[PDB]
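Purpose: get a first structural picture of the assembly so the mutagenesis plan has something to point at.
Setup: two entries, given in the order below. No constraints added.
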Amino acid sequence: FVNQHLCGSHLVEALYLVCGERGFFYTPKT
Amino acid sequence: GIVEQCCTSICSLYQLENYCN
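Result (structure tokens, whole complex):
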């Protein structure tokens, strides 16, 4: 269910069922 | 330096389907 996935744990949730695994980039710039 | 990709500009079934490859 992808709907209004803009921050607010949305990018996380939508990503918690797409990769099918616990481990992604999710890293800003330095 | 906080980008706003898929948080308020772009992203919507098309570029994802590979956020982690």
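The two ends of chain B are 24 Å apart (CA to CA).
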